[PDB]
């Protein structure tokens, strides 16, 4: 727990220092300026002012002595001994620390219960706001409709996206796809006329942080461009666990910020058959791996008897080789364990998916890409003064036991190579499972990651490989990379296994004519 506290202190004190530098101001003014940028929502501004009240005068004192954020946070004891973010020799650290010494909430009784209620729903990966308990929400975050189709009736547990339509939806839109009622000419229900025989299916992601599109905007950490507008998305991002599933390559339903034209798998499936409107679920968690998926897979919502079938993407693309343990190789999953873990998941899916479903296993990428692309580039926190490379950033995180992938985010080339060998072996295990293992309620397919193909296509497009990686964590594929990978999966399945995606619905135009945007998302 010291790790996060240390990292959080070092980030905050770094922004304060750089805001002072950028604006040529006192530290007092820089702290007031940061608080002025933060929204009131989620008590962020008030928390900022509380911190300034509590620690402001000590921060002023130490930053005035020209100590950097890492030293300050040890001195204030947010960090406990020594992890260097900024380049400074050991001798200079011992100097500064002796001089520093020389120079120098859910316990609220009315919050405890709601805090536990929120921690629980997050741990179970189910929406906190869900009156009828069908796991679909009217609220966007806290596992709400950013993560799955919005509930059109939160007072009816039999109304939710992906349901087979009750009574062809004559009187209610029971599956939230915006199609319901009867044609006045022939009295035929629109959902019957427009969706019967079209074989609707949902998209379900079983994913990790990359699949849920973990993303810390570098705008939150770069003083030179910071403003009130930088942090408007901070409350919702925090209550989404710093994930942005609504923009992900598999389950995204908002229009891309990036400016590439590639669309999510959900968007493509909705476009192929508009009856699939709102039928997405991101069953994804930061840190998810083949080993621990069983701890939250029960949050998936698909009633075997009453729901349309689904396409399920199994996308554990790294945490079976990526971990934060100093001796990192012993915690990497073995091929034999991977086989046992995946078979357990598939056996579980078989008894919880409607017949006619499809499961796609994703291979693991080769992540040596991370070090090679980034190690000599400057991290957002090092860009002002050109003093924190990604190598220094990775080393700092490793010292804090917070590096999310010690095997690849490492200056040790032999270890980077070993990690890639293991990832390939695990991908080959997934491949073999898809080729040889059969289940009653779904068929099973393998698609490799093949980031070399994505990097090549990106290079043809005029891009550089470093532009495919989240700038703040230096680890996850960013929104562009995620959409490029989803496009590759879509095309490959379209070419080899077109039945997985179904046919285009010939009534799509008539659906749009009668129902417009089908209620939106
Ligand atoms: C581009 C494709 C080819 C190369 C890709 C390389 C392999 C990618 C594997 C991603 C697999 C997802 C693993 C995961 O869930 O992540 C898990 C970890 C934790 O277990 O996620 C994290 O928590 C990352 C945290 C890193 C810390 C960064 C600190 C940023 C400063 C904090 C400021 C925030 C203030 C609100
Ligand atoms: C939602 O379902 C309930 C039935 O439990 C019904 O009373 C209510 O009218 C429904 N809402 C809409 C908009 O149909
Ligand atoms: C680099 O990684 C390999 C593989 O784990 C290990 O044997 C070696 O000791 C590491 N080198 C250093 C300098 O730590
Ligand atoms: Ca409902
Ligand atoms: Ca609900
Ligand atoms: Ca409907």
From Swiss-Prot:
Glycans are attached at residues 24, 153, 355, 412. Residues 119-123 are annotated as: Lipopolysaccharide binding. Residues 2-81 form the Saposin B-type domain. Ca(2+) 1 binds at residues 130, 132, 134, 136, 151, 154. Disulfide bonds join 6-79, 9-73, 35-48, 83-399, 83-399, 106-115, 152-176, 195-275, 322-405. CDD domains: acyloxyacyl_hydrolase_like (cd01826). The active site is at 209. The record marks 291 as: Interacts with lipopolysaccharide. Gene3D superfamilies: Saposin-like, SGNH hydrolase. Residues 3-35 are annotated as: Important for enzyme activity, localization to cytoplasmic vesicles, and protein stability. This is Acyloxyacyl hydrolase large subunit.
